[PDB]
């Protein structure tokens, strides 16, 4: 009840003395490189605005050496954090941030660094409306690092690529179903299912039933057991084998579609 916020306000305004103690501790610290980055990120928990820039600078200079570049990587992303409390944000620093991923990706194969580096890129460029860049570097990320992480990152990068402009859903659609397979493979069901649904809706928005027909044969395999049959039935019906140049397996497939629509007709009649 009220006691929580009472102790909360008192503890916050006693931590202001505590953060002052830590400021004294770091002013003592300036008098190792790991000590420097501990200094940085500790006062970044309450986020020093310019000491951000000086930690940025010092970390860059020294961690040119000491080729364990998590120091320097984390340094420039906390420089991006500074850019959040920096109106100019020296927007080329964002370019620096892009730099951050591509080289440091290769520096260490601990992919999580690449992940949240790209995520900070995502958010900060969303603070610039120019999502195109992070769209491209997220799509160049998502091919790799997994077949599962590849999938949810495929849709992340995908909808993000669509964040800048509504149309050109094309490669969006392609890789999001070519990852919806992996979604059915190793993903929590609600996210994979929202994959399938949003992908299919994006299909219908600008129809192009050619590859949608085979992905709707997949809709059917999840409809021959779980989903509704009529959607697959009408999907194959609009393909309409003669004049659509279907193939031997496709004719057999629409035989099976006749089987499913037979189930549907029998259940209706």
Residue numbers in the entry: 355 to 385, 424 to 661
Cite, word for word, the article reporting this structure.
However, in the regions of TRAPPC8 and TRAPPC11 located on either side of the core the local resolution was suitable for de novo model building. In the case of TRAPPC8, residues 350–660 form an α‐solenoid of thirteen α‐helices that includes the site of interaction with TRAPPC2. TRAPPC8 (yellow) is formed by thirteen α‐helices and binds TRAPPC2 via helices 9, 10 and 11. The less well‐resolved C‐terminal region (residues 660–1,319) forms the arm that connects to TRAPPC12 and TRAPPC13. This part of TRAPPC8 is not present in the yeast orthologue Trs85, consistent with it forming an armless complex. The interaction between TRAPPC2 and TRAPPC8 encloses a total surface area of ~550 Å with the TRAPPC2‐binding region of TRAPPC8 formed by α‐helices 9 and 11. In addition, α‐helix 9 contains several polar and charged residues, such as Arg562 and Lys563, that are likely to interact with key residues in TRAPPC2, including Asp46. Interestingly, Asp46 appears to be particularly critical for the assembly of TRAPP complexes as mutation of this residue causes spondyloepiphyseal dysplasia tarda in humans and disrupts the TRAPP complexes in yeast.
The TRAPP complexes are nucleotide exchange factors that play essential roles in membrane traffic and autophagy. TRAPPII activates Rab11, and TRAPPIII activates Rab1, with the two complexes sharing a core of small subunits that affect nucleotide exchange but being distinguished by specific large subunits that are essential for activity in vivo. We report a cryo‐EM structure of the entire Drosophila TRAPPIII complex. The TRAPPIII‐specific subunits TRAPPC8 and TRAPPC11 hold the catalytic core like a pair of tongs, with TRAPPC12 and TRAPPC13 positioned at the joint between them.
